[PDB]
A paper describes a structure:
pmcCytochrome (cyt) bc1 complexes are quinol:cytochrome c oxidoreductases (E.C. 1.10.2.2) and are central components of respiratory and photosynthetic electron transport chains in bacteria and mitochondria. The simplest cyt bc1 complexes, such as the bacterial complexes from Rhodobacter capsulatus or Paracoccus denitrificans, comprise three subunits: cyt b, which binds two b-type hemes (bL and bH) one quinol and one quinone; cyt c1 that binds one c-type heme; and the Rieske subunit that binds a two-iron two-sulfur cluster (FeS). The cytochrome bc1 complex of Rhodobacter sphaeroides has a unique supernumerary subunit, named subunit IV, which enhances its activity. Following successful purification of active complex, we used cryogenic electron microscopy (cryo-EM) to determine the structure of the four-subunit R. sphaeroides cyt bc1 at 2.9 Å resolution, revealing the position of the TMH of SIV and providing insights into its function.
Residue numbers in the entry:
A (entry chain C), F (entry chain G): 25 to 278
B (entry chain B): 1 to 433
C (entry chain D): 78 to 106
D (entry chain A): 9 to 187
E (entry chain F): 1 to 432
G (entry chain E): 7 to 187
H (entry chain H): 79 to 105
The structure:
């Protein structure tokens, strides 16, 4: 993963939480745009009503579910989707499944492999997702304008792509910060209308989907934070009372 | 038991009379827990209790997870997602088990280096050391097989690399690899047998730990001075010792509570830091990740493994004299095992009569070099095998063998140790006057 | 009497552990 | 003073809770997971059948019976008096909880041609073998020999209760909703 | 060690002395194998070694089979057929594990009835008896969950019935049932947790066996006379006893070999006789088979469960006085557990001072009646619930309970026992 | 099924073995007649070449497999059968799978629940299969001469079937020995042309196919019996040596 | 005769117990050897077609995709239009040939007549299945995972690193069509 | 000399089991 813009998402840090509205916006954008190619085969549709997620009402989740056509795993007949179904697999064969992409990508590295950057900044998966979505320039790098691979697009964040020979340094080393990706620039200004009138810039939509994809990768992050706090409190109290008991005991021998 | 003068259990209450005459289990428990322990133990003696707890944590979380995981390649990753996503607390149970493996390995490395410094491997404790080495090897196999179980990209390609090492062994290696895998390649038969063996080996580890605890109860604890407790009389023994309960039980449970406070902070607020993000990608046997890194506690041995190549002079010599039977691949595999073996043989390689490194003024230098070298091997194991990391890996690997095979044998001839204190009581009173 | 110092210890540990975990469950630091 | 063992019991308490709070999740993880919770409600509709035979339909992991009874079994003289049953409750989700175990309170229809039930023996959950098995018509549970009559009412053997009637209603004369 | 006068271990080889000064593992092994054992033991004492063999066999075959089985309801049956059909020796390994469970339950029923006859449960041996009862309960759970694993029709409907038993507990029972199931029905959660627990519990059984061995070493072995070994001196103890190695090790290994000749003959030439054909049918939640019969070692308890129908007078009384809190279902479940509970309490229910039953001329009758009753309970378990088998099973269950709760307390108050020999030496000499 | 015909089969008894030619005849009968309705989803087709079975040449098994065609996992589309494929599932959903039918049925019972009949006669599976195949009489029992079910056929061996109430009894249970089965009488004389010129009577074909289905249920019966003999010999030798050891050792205690 | 000694008898019993053990242990480790997997070496018979992307298939063998390629209408032409000195990855590196050869266009083939050649679809120097379909401008393959292009002969010239698309055991090829054995 | 009977017995008992389990079962 290429070096990301350090987006200040609201869920970061021990007290960070998901904004339900931002999650709903990201879900909307995913539904209107990304679901054309990317699946979420590990995400159960019923999770849309789960506490700490979008918390859509159950009838609205049911309405949402019915838009999908599901080959019934027992009947073989095609039917409307149900909340107990998962999101479809990726319709486009080479589009990666997004159920875990916000965990399956690191945006921060090193320095020198020491990992301290990931220690402070976290893994940076949402920031990577945002950087890819924001990473299509208005025009290619000035080098090798005659050699762009057909059917691919330059992205500043993507590092796994093909690179023209003319852009490779003689050592086989990438001169460009980015590389060419098969993903066409997916977002466009005001592409999705937020009914509340929220900002529909590409940056806003990219952030909202990055937050939604973070929730898709860790729906129970909130509960993990709360268990973390309650455990830390129990072990703090236990630590202090054991320290005082140890001190009282060992004072008796010296 | 240990030869230290001590009070035996006597059954007090009627129920204690009734049981003790029939089955002395309470007597055995008392004799175990009331063991007179040196007064001068420092915080490096906590790690055995941390390890004992970690074994319980790993066992109970594994058994819980084993109720929900499915050892089939179509279902394993999906069942891990089911754990993360539908099971009550299943996210915490997984993160606890995965980071608890790292906790377990850092604790064993601390416990080993404590032993290496204070000389707890020396006579009469050689058996305790050997049982420790067996425990460590069983942990290594357990953790590897467990890391294969989630069947991500890193699980599959790491298994494919590591099982490839057995293929290096001339002649039999192809048969050994095929018998391990159950086929030409890492596949469902590999996942399922690795699941069975990963369930099995923790109980073998627990049995070895029981033998280990019996061994040290059979020798008594070492202490920072290396000076043995006075066997002469109960008076002198008590002047040198305090009972393990309550003093050191409460000391170790305090230190455990602090270690678990930091462990649970990690598990709460950054559980994916130790993991490898590519293991959130399903295993794709067609498409290797950009860089396969085995997880951190294997890296120093994987560093030693990669550090030897046909470019290396000693490898060229080994190839020549062996008529190419020792190719660089098998040389590296032999080195990777030799690194663990030579640490196992350390009770007989350290010729020096002085036990504690605290009084060995030159040994301290080469020990702290070995510790830095173990850190360098851990870090270099993650780096790409180009210049200069090839040099740093080769030099570190050479120093690892040079420590056990050369420096330790020579120091027992050359060193001029300091005189230890006359007794543990004196050393204790020197601090706590 | 004597036992209520023990039992009061028993009770004191109970409320102190629960209350502090409750406070942090308000998430307001 | 005694504040020694005051402190020692306070630390012992913090300990026993820290362990106690660790043990409960190891139990609660075996309670029904949110997917199994979600399957607790299902919608289905099922069609017609000839008389003198029964269907079976899966729901909630268990069979639903639908029998269209014979003339001999819709009538049976209605001979069973309410005072000679083992269980006198209708066990019927479609009527009040004070209903009695009467032939018409068991059936779904007014004539008594249509009887819809859980196919689950109220003893320990085996499927009662139907046709006209057992010594009272109706069904026979092979697992411990409980006998159900033609109305699915318990007559003999270990079972405590009449076969429960799920929430179900006709949509058309040809088909019946279950959810 | 045991309180019999004996020679302790003495290291003599250089390596022996090097090790013994560091870890007395060899000293403990020597003490374990050299324990002075009563020389008058008969063939009924072989079953402990056969039980250890059966445990080792079942563990090792489980571990091997666990490399190939898949605990998923779409794959379990197919993976068992894969074991039967593709794996090298897998058919034999599976028939070994399946018949070994029957061998194991045979050897524990003979070991139990030996202990009941010779009074090996009496003081000071109540603790080894109780550990034996814990071992037996763990074996029962292990074998049941193992039999759920093939996911055949019998596996599925057994898993259904048995989880219903926990549902029978008034009030809380539905919670325990749904916690065991993980849901409203037997499904993949049940199979997968039953696999995990079937893997776990043999190691618990092994640790219990270790405690059982330590318990009987701590008491010393009982013998057919019930007279204790003379503790006075080495010279007298050596007349009453002989060292366990070699004499009884070789005797037990001989008996084991001759038993396994028949075991392997069965596994070779008739491995399906003890099983159920219906478990070769895939589980079908929509129809229960017409041949619901537990695996034979559970049949006495299944018979006791079925014996208490709602018309049984004692059940009616209990239902009345409990104001409906007890019913035939829950009464039957309580009885089916009482059958094992009351057997666990036998060290205290037997009031008699005389240890060995062979000197108890009335006790012999009720004991052999009990053994016949246990055979009847096994046989009635396979029969239908019609007349007369309802009566037979009810009478059998009543005698089972009456033996422990009435007959044993009375006999110790009224029996006129014979005088046992003065010593084990005398008995051995009298028999040559 | 009660009162199954105790057919002598060559594989019966500890020295019994499969007749390879009888197995090939049974395979032919199954393939031409029975395979239209029933399937063998658990039988790998390749096993027809393996020792102890029909032991067909692998080229013949490959030709045989090509008669099938299967929805291959990699293509998702109908693909001609290969030896690594299994036999297909039952084409008629009503018809049970036969992979284990010869083990899933008992032909012998009792006496009086004692299991002794099975102890001498065996389980009786292929005998039961033969009895069902041979079990269709020329004429119904005449109790329901005008009253038998239409979609079902009386078979004197089958016990689980429906019964007309005129044949049924309340006082007893059932007049007739058998019951009515949904399977039409499947065999007719000379229905299969045995290229060997062997007897192709209903009796002969029913035996041959019952033996084939026995091999289908226990394809390694031969190896199992061989291992049985080997283990019995080892344990006999060991038992005799241990007996002589015990006797010569305890003769010291005398 | 055998000795009358007791220790003779004792050791004979130890021998019988030793072999009764060894014959019992071997099945427990033998069962871990391949079982149903040995039939992964299937014959891969297919119906014929002319034209290279017609009959030739990415078909799975040894659990992994393969290419079997008649040098029909592009591969022999381009094989007769790429020099041995143009290729990078040199030695024949081939199991169906007996011994090494430099950078050879044929002898990658089953036959010295060189009418069929075969390679693993699983491009193995890292791991990919490069897109065949005679595509890539030497008429061979191109790798989306890695960016190499391949000779129609299955041999590397352009790309980050030189390894040829590797050659498995194949022959017989008799029914005008894909076959293995 | 020593190991006359001990070694000879062991090999005899081993071979005999291998013989009688093989040939009579196979033939
Ligand atoms: C299988 C391994 C299981 C291990 C379980 C460990 C559990 C630890 C949880 C609590 C133990 C906490 C520390 C107790 C320290 C006691 C130290 C001690 O030895 O003294 C016992 C001390 C007497 O002192 P002396 O012996 O005379 O002098 C000491 C110097 N010779 O006895 C006491 O009066 C204090 C005993 C403390 C409680 C012991 C019983 C604990 C059982 C249950 C209590 C838990 C209640 C929890 C309530 C929940 C509250 C939130
Ligand atoms: C010595 C003690 C143990 C160690 C060191 C250990 C280590 C590990 C590790 C490192 C993983 C990979 C975690 C990941 O990154 O996904 C793992 C997974 C797993 N372990 Fe263990 N383990 C131990 C004991 C057990 C036990 C006793 C069981 C019981 C069967 C068990 C069952 C599992 C299962 C099912 C998985 C895969 C599912 C998952 O947890 O992700 N483990 N183990
Ligand atoms: C499962 C992991 C292990 C557990 C639970 C365990 C347990 C213990 C315990 C409780 C102690 C006493 C307290 C202490 O000294 O910290 C101890 C000491 C010791 N351990 Fe371990 N151990 C483990 C692994 C190891 C390993 C890997 C080694 C080294 C190869 C080792 C070697 C030693 C030695 C030499 C001692 C000192 C013995 C003495 O002082 O006489 N142990 N161990
Ligand atoms: C895993 C199964 C078991 C094993 C491996 C085992 C092991 C042993 C062994 C080796 C002996 C000594 C030799 C002998 O008497 O045969 C013994 C004795 C005994 N066992 Fe067991 N046992 C098992 C189960 C049981 C059970 C289920 C019970 C009864 C509930 C039981 C109760 C006894 C008693 C009372 C003795 C006599 C002890 C004495 O003589 O002092 N055991 N056991
Ligand atoms: C106390 C020792 C054990 C007993 C009494 C026991 C009993 C059983 C029984 C009765 C079955 C059903 C077999 C059948 O009739 O089809 C079974 C199946 C099974 N057991 Fe065990 N078992 C034991 C140990 C183990 C262990 C330790 C494991 C795991 C390592 C294991 C793994 C399995 C598996 C995978 C199956 C299903 C496959 C099969 O059909 O064999 N067993 N067990
Ligand atoms: S389980 Fe249905 S009658 Fe008992
Ligand atoms: S792996 Fe495709 S040529 Fe590099």
């Amino acid at each position: 993963g290429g070096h990301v813009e350090d987006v200040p998402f609201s869920f970061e840090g021990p007290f960070g939480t998901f904004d339900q509205h931002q999650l709903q916006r990201g879900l909307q954008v995913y539904t209107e745009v990304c679901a054309a190619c990317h699946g979420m085969k590990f995400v159960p549709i019923r999770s849309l009503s789960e506490p700490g997620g979008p918390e859509l009402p159950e009838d609205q989740v049911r309405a949402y579910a019915t838009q999908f056509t599901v080959t019934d795993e027992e009947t073989g007949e095609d039917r409307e989707g149900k909340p107990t179904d998962h999101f479809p697999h990726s319709a486009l064969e080479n589009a990666p499944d997004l159920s875990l992409m916000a965990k399956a990508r690191a945006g921060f590295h090193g320095p020198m492999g020491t990992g301290i950057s990931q220690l402070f900044n976290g893994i940076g998966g949402p920031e990577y997702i945002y950087s890819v979505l924001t990473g299509f320039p208005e025009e290619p790098p000035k080098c090798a304008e005659g050699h762009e691979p057909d059917g691919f697009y330059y992205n500043r964040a993507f590092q796994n792509g093909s690179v023209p020979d003319t852009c490779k340094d003689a050592n086989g080393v990438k001169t460009t910060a980015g590389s060419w990706i098969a993903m066409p620039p997916p977002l466009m200004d005001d592409l999705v209308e937020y009914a509340d009138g929220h900002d529909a810039s590409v940056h806003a939509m990219a952030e909202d989907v990055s937050a939604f994809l973070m929730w898709a990768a860790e729906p129970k992050l909130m509960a993990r934070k709360q268990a973390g706090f309650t455990a830390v409190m129990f072990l703090t109290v236990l630590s202090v009372l054991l320290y005082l008991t140890n001190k009282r005991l060992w004072a008796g021998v010296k | 038991m240990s030869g230290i003068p001590h009070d035996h259990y006597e059954p007090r209450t009627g129920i204690e009379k009734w049981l003790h005459s029939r089955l002395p289990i309470v007597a055995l428990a008392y004799d175990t827990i009331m063991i007179p322990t040196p007064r001068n133990l420092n915080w490096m003696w906590i790690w055995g209790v941390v390890l004992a707890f970690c074994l319980v944590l790993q066992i109970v979380t594994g058994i819980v997870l084993a109720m929900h995981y499915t050892p089939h390649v179509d279902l394993a990753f999906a069942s891990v997602e089911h754990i993360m996503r539908n099971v009550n607390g299943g996210f915490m149970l997984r993160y606890l088990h995965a980071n608890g493996a790292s906790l377990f390995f850092i604790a064993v490395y601390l416990h080993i280096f404590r032993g290496l410094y204070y000389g707890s491997y020396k006579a009469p404790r050689e058996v305790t050391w050997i049982v420790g080495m067996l425990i460590y090897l069983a942990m290594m196999a357990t953790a590897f097989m467990g890391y294969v179980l989630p069947w991500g990209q890193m699980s599959f390609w790491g298994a494919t690399v590591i099982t490839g090492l057995f293929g290096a062994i001339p002649g039999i290696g192809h048969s050994i690899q095929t018998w391990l895998l159950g086929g030409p390649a890492v596949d469902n038969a590999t996942l399922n047998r690795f699941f069975s063996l990963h369930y099995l080996l923790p109980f073998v580890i627990a049995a070895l730990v029981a033998i280990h605890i019996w061994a040290f109860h059979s020798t008594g604890n070492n202490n920072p001075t290396g000076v043995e407790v006075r066997r002469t009389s109960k008076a002198e023994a008590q002047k040198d010792t305090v009972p393990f309960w309550p003093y050191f039980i409460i000391k170790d449970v305090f230190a455990l509570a602090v270690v678990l406070l930091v462990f649970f902070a990690i598990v709460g607020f950054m559980p994916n830091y130790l993991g490898h993000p590519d293991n959130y990608i399903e295993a794709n046997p067609l498409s290797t990740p950009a860089h396969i890194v085995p997880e951190w506690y294997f890296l120093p041995f994987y560093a030693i493994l990669r550090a030897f190549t046909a470019d290396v002079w000693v490898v060229q010599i080994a190839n020549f004299i062996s008529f190419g039977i020792i190719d660089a691949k098998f040389f590296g595999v032999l080195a990777m095992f030799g690194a663990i073996l030579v640490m196992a043989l350390v009770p007989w390689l350290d010729t020096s009569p002085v036990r504690s490194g605290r009084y060995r003024p030159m040994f301290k230098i080469y020990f702290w070099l070995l510790a830095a070298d173990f850190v360098i091997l851990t870090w270099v194991g993650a780096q790409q095998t180009t210049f200069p990391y090839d040099w740093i890996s080769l030099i570190a690997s050479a120093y690892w063998f040079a420590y056990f095979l050369v420096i330790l044998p020579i120091l027992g001839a050359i060193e001029k140790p300091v005189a230890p204190p006359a007794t543990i009581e004196e050393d204790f009173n020197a601090h706590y006057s | 009497w004597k036992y209520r110092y023990r039992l009061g210890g028993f009770a004191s540990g109970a409320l102190l552990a629960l209350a502090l975990a409750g406070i942090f469950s308000t998430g307001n630091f | 003073g005694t504040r020694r063992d005051f402190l020692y019991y306070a630390t012992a308490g913090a300990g026993a809770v820290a362990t106690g709070a660790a043990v409960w999740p190891l139990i609660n993880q075996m309670n029904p997971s949110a997917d199994v919770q979600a399957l607790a409600s299902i919608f289905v509709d099922v069609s017609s059948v000839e008389p003198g035979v029964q269907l079976t339909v899966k729901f909630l992991g268990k069979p639903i019976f639908i029998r269209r009874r014979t003339e001999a079994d819709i009538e049976l003289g209605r001979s069973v008096q309410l005072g000679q049953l083992v269980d006198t409750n209708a066990r019927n989700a479609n009527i009040d909880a004070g209903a009695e175990a009467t032939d018409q309170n068991r059936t779904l229809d007014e004539a008594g041609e249509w009887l819809v039930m859980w196919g689950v023996c109220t003893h320990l959950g085996c499927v009662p073998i139907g046709g006209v098995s057992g010594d009272f018509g109706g069904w026979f549970c092979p697992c411990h020999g409980s006998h159900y009559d033609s109305a699915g009412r318990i007559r003999k053997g270990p079972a405590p209760e009449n076969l429960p009637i799920p929430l179900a209603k006709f949509i058309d004369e040809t088909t019946i909703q279950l959810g």
